Amino acid sequence: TTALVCDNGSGLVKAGFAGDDAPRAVFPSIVGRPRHQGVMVGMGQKDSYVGDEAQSKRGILTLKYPIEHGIITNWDDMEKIWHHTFYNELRVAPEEHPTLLTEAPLNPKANREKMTQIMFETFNVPAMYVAIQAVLSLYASGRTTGIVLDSGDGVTHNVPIYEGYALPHAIMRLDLAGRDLTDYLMKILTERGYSFVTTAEREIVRDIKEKLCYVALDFENEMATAASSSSLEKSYELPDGQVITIGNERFRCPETLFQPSFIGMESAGIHETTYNSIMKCDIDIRKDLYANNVMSGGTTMYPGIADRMQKEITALAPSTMKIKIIAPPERKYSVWIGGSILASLSTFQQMWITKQEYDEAGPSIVHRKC
Amino acid sequence: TTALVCDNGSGLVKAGFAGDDAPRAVFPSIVGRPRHQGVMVGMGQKDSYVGDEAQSKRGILTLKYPIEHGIITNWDDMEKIWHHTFYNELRVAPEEHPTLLTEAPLNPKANREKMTQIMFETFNVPAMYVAIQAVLSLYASGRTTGIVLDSGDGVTHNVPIYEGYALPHAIMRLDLAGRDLTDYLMKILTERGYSFVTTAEREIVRDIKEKLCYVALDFENEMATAASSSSLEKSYELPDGQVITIGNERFRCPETLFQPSFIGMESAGIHETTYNSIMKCDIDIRKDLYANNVMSGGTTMYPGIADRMQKEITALAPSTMKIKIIAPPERKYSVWIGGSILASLSTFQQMWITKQEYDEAGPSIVHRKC
Amino acid sequence: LRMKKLNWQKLPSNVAREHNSMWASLSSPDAEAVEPDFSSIERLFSTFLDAKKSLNLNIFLKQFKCSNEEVAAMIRAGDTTKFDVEVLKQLLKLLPEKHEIENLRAFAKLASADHFYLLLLAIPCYQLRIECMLLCEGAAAVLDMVRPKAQLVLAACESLLTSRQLPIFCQLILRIGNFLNYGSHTGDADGFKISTLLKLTETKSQQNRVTLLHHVLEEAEKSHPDLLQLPRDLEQPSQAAGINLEIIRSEASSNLKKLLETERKVSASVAEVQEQYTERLQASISAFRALDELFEAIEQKQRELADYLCEDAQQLSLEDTFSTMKAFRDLFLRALKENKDRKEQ
Amino acid sequence: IFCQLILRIGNFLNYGSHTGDADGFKISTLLKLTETKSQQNRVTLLHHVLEEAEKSHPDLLQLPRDLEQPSQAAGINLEIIRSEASSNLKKLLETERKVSASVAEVQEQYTERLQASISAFRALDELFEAIEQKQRELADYLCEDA
Numbered sequence A, B: 001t002t003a004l005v006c007d008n009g010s011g012l013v014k015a016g017f018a019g020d021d022a023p024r025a026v027f028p029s030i031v032g033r034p035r036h037q038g039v040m041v042g043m044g045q046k047d048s049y050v051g052d053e054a055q056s057k058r059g060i061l062t063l064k065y066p067i068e069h070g071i072i073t074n075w076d077d078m079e080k081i082w083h084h085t086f087y088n089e090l091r092v093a094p095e096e097h098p099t100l101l102t103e104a105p106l107n108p109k110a111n112r113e114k115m116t117q118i119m120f121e122t123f124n125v126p127a128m129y130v131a132i133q134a135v136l137s138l139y140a141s142g143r144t145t146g147i148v149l150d151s152g153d154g155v156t157h158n159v160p161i162y163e164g165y166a167l168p169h170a171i172m173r174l175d176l177a178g179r180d181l182t183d184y185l186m187k188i189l190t191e192r193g194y195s196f197v198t199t200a201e202r203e204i205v206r207d208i209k210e211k212l213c214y215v216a217l218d219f220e221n222e223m224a225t226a227a228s229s230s231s232l233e234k235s236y237e238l239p240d241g242q243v244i245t246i247g248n249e250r251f252r253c254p255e256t257l258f259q260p261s262f263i264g265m266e267s268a269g270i271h272e273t274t275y276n277s278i279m280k281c282d283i284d285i286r287k288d289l290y291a292n293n294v295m296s297g298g299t300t301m302y303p304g305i306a307d308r309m310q311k312e313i314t315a316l317a318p319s320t321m322k323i324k325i326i327a328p329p330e331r332k333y334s335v336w337i338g339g340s341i342l343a344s345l346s347t348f349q350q351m352w353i354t355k356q357e358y359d360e361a362g363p364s365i366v367h368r369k370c
Numbered sequence C: 001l002r003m004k005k006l007n008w009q010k011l012p013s014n015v016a017r018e019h020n021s022m023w024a025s026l027s028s029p030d031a032e033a034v035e036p037d038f039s040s041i042e043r044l045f046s047t048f049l050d051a052k053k054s055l056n057l058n059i060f061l062k063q064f065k066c067s068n069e070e071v072a073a074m075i076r077a078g079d080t081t082k083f084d085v086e087v088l089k090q091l092l093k094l095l096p097e098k099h100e101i102e103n104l105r106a107f108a109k110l111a112s113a114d115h116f117y118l119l120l121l122a123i124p125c126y127q128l129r130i131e132c133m134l135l136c137e138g139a140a141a142v143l144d145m146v147r148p149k150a151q152l153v154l155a156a157c158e159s160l161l162t163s164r165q166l167p168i169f170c171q172l173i174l175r176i177g178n179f180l181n182y183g184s185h186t187g188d189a190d191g192f193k194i195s196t197l198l199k200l201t202e203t204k205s206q207q208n209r210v211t212l213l214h215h216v217l218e219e220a221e222k223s224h225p226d227l228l229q230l231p232r233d234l235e236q237p238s239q240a241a242g243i244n245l246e247i248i249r250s251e252a253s254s255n256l257k258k259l260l261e262t263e264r265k266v267s268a269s270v271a272e273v274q275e276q277y278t279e280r281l282q283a284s285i286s287a288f289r290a291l292d293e294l295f296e297a298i299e300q301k302q303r304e305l306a307d308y309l310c311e312d313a314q315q316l317s318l319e320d321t322f323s324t325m326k327a328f329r330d331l332f333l334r335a336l337k338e339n340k341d342r343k344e345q
Numbered sequence D: 001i002f003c004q005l006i007l008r009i010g011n012f013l014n015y016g017s018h019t020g021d022a023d024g025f026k027i028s029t030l031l032k033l034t035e036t037k038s039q040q041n042r043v044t045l046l047h048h049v050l051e052e053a054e055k056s057h058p059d060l061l062q063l064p065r066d067l068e069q070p071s072q073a074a075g076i077n078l079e080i081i082r083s084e085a086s087s088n089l090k091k092l093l094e095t096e097r098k099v100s101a102s103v104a105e106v107q108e109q110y111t112e113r114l115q116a117s118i119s120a121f122r123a124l125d126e127l128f129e130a131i132e133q134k135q136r137e138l139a140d141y142l143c144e145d146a
């Protein structure tokens, strides 16, 4: 029996099969319910539009994310998403396929037990394992020692890894992530006259950011340049045919990642956060970490971010130090790619959490083998 | 005339007048500045707020410590604190008012000259003396020969003293102090869900450790105690009215002093530091020094700490050797108390740098006459 | 009248003028000389003891919060209201030296540190006075702590001598051990040392989790009065572990030797000392007699115990039995929980 | 010009004390020039000497133009740049013997590659000796101990 991999993200759910190059089913992790009145009758109506179905009909639905800041709260919504993946997107039987799941570090201990409990009872999987997001991200690159900047949708965390094992005392975490950058975009879009309030219009602002946003190399010069000439302005067409124009709002949105004071946060940017995580490690291994910055996650794809981080890290590290940042093109699915690689290896066998062991310690055995 | 005694610490500043028993003015050693925009114009506004004024308004300020690990880093910020203490808290003109100062052990040579020029020129102090934190700590305990475990907010120290002079070859140092202890509590507090990622939110987590955290005699026994029953749980109310509950995290925060591998440090515990610092002395003195372990600083005010280390030192020390842990009830302000005693001595007036004496030799004169 | 002083690292006047030094050129009109505004610069920037002994004495006198005259009366009168065991030790070290007495005798104007010495000098035989109450108070805190140790070790030996399960338990392993080691150098031995029971868990079974101690406990579980009443009899020897009798015996003898030595000095003093401290010293002398007498009973009791185990003398040094027996009992309790856990699961 | 002016001014301020009347001072003195404060408490000795130096712009104000190269040179220690060049050279020579003893199939492609890198570092370490000679004059220029 082949294994299964399902990277439960905050914004997107990427699941497939072990050994595959790409996920078989990636869909947003949103569950929507109707808010208007069902005047029409005699027609097939549902109240549990989840994932891709809810995205298409978002005009008549309220879109809610079951996962906020990487922590699952709506546990009845997560059961729907897991049931949607196992039976609709993949069309597989959970009781005959071992499963692998991915969970962010520095997560509440209560999250792990509940996730194990659902899968071993509601779905009755034969085997299950939980692995760290940043550990699987480095396995995609083929390495086993490096420092991973994983800016997902809900949380930005930095996990230095050495010889295949994480360093729990040097992990830094920043709550500013991709979703918080979307909300800051709507805040400054009202400056020019465009108002987006609905959760249906929240997705529109997300797609504006995914296309017209880039990281400026020099903020002071790029702000002076934008005010000097209209050469930086682009245009976007709304689903109703309306067109909007944004000038210096293009790079001011992802700049918050490096100046978190824009949205009121106090912690330093990702460039200073990564630097601080290096000094928490031993001085004899900082040579192996300063040259293996492997970005991952969707939020790390603003054009110019790789150049910007190299420039900022250089001004912090000693001049003689060598700084090399690896930015793989497939960093969106890096966390899943490492999981697909790991599950196929025969060494990962004899490490499963089988049914005969889960009942020995209940949902607390997930902490025994993680 | 009277002589002022001013103790400059990493966390608190304790000052007052010589001859008394308790410090007149003890306040945190912070200098905060606004991070927002001042909309109103009628009210009086100030560039910076010093002392407990900044602590009260800490919701809209970032708090910066002028002293890190005992050494004075921000020399312009520490000139504000001394001005605040002399003119606002004590409200006494430093002119015609000789003062006394306490300096950390192994103080850098440059810092000693810098302070002498600051007080003699700016404040026009007729006389001044500089002492050592560990030397004054043993005076306040009614002794003259012993080993002091001066564990403050910045740095933990073990300074064996013999007849009023420290032993520089046997002086140890451990960077496991109160500030590092509260930063470890924040990391493990997220295991239950609660998150504190702000400097202003560090003071909130400081008071949780001060009130609820204690030391367990047997780590394994307390580990099994918390798992067996929830009797260890305690409830604390945040300033905004929320309630938080902590179980086994109560005794795992001060345990890092004895198992420094928890925080990532590769050094040994405080129990081994005293044992290591005692083998650098003479064999005959070791019998005398073993029965004069004197506590100091605020970081040692934990329930069952004067007994836990006695159990630990018993294992390291030989069976014939005797151990006497001295933990005076007022050990929080021991350093200042010794300074008050020293300044009141009739024969102590010969060790004062007169104003006319300073007119011949500059700030380099502090190394002499001391 | 006065100028702000700026501190610089002054260079020697013979080195700064060398040819390689740049200051040599400035000393001669070889560069463009510039003159500052001198008018504005002035209006804009305008005891006999050593310290080791004298200071330590004042610090010693600052834990009483009384005058120097008052503290002299307490020493003369021998009052111990504010004087403790540790305080006396510091006073013993802080005593007049050979040079200190000569300077004072050769001699208000003198500092308060030497003022207490002058008052202390007037006190007759001040050296003897401090030693009198140091030993008496110290002896009071010694007898009440050695005595429970002496009773505990004596009780442990009697219980160990009168134990019933050890003859049954040591026979079962001996019978088993002969079967296990039949046909080799080991086995068929009449007896073994007491340290054998400490290595019982080293014999693993096929399951690798059940040891020889676990198996003999499984068959002993059927007969609860047999081999399971043993830990009830091992409580007293277990507590005696870590309490060596050599230190407690030396401490009693050392204090008595010092107390007896000072007894002659006290007897040579005036009658005032005798009528209110001499009877205190002899009271402690008689009290310690019962302490050392019980030690002989312990030595007699352990002599039978040393021959009880059929082990060579000077090899069964009391503390060896206490440490080994406590560890053996500790391992016994752990095996019982595992055996009970095995039965239920 | 600058070091002479502070020496002239410093002698005036320290007249009649142990300090003063000195023929020179260490280079670290200028780092403590701004610590002295005047009556205003915001105008230091550095500020005052600049006020009179502002009258003569070519004097004492062209200095920061000459200090850009030494300023950029800070933070680059020579104890790691010299060790790194020597450490790589030692490894190259040790492996040079190994490849030479190997089959000629490796020598025709890799032996000549190593010799190219070995010869390149020769000019690198030669410049290091030039720096050592240059800094020796500078050390005696400031009259500071070796």
Ligand SMILES: Nc1ncnc2c1ncn2[C@@H]1O[C@H](COP(=O)(O)OP(=O)(O)OP(=O)(O)O)[C@@H](O)[C@H]1O
Binding pocket: B008, B009, B010, B011, B012, B013, B070, B133, B151, B152, B153, B154, B155, B178, B179, B182, B206, B209, B210, B211, B296, B297, B298, B299, B300, B301, B302, B332
């Ligand atoms: N009851 C308590 N329990 C635990 N920690 C405490 C308690 N009271 C105070 N502390 C700790 O004491 C620290 C500061 O105390 P202290 O007065 O020794 O510091 P300090 O004077 O700044 O030190 P230093 O001389 O090292 O600079 C606080 O940061 C706090 O963590």
Ligand SMILES: Nc1ncnc2c1ncn2[C@@H]1O[C@H](COP(=O)(O)OP(=O)(O)O)[C@@H](O)[C@H]1O
Binding pocket: A008, A009, A010, A011, A012, A013, A151, A152, A153, A154, A178, A179, A182, A206, A209, A210, A211, A213, A297, A298, A299, A300, A301, A302, A332
């Ligand atoms: N080209 C892009 N430019 C900027 N942001 C992007 C881009 N593509 C995706 N994102 C951001 O990535 C986020 C989710 O990506 P992903 O890392 O897969 O989420 P998760 O890891 O939480 O599943 C979205 O919120 C989106 O804002």
Ligand SMILES: [Mg+2]
Binding pocket: A007, A008, A009, A010, A133, A152, A153, A297, A335
């Ligand atoms: Mg992810």
Ligand SMILES: [Mg+2]
Binding pocket: B008, B009, B133, B152, B297, B335
């Ligand atoms: Mg202190």
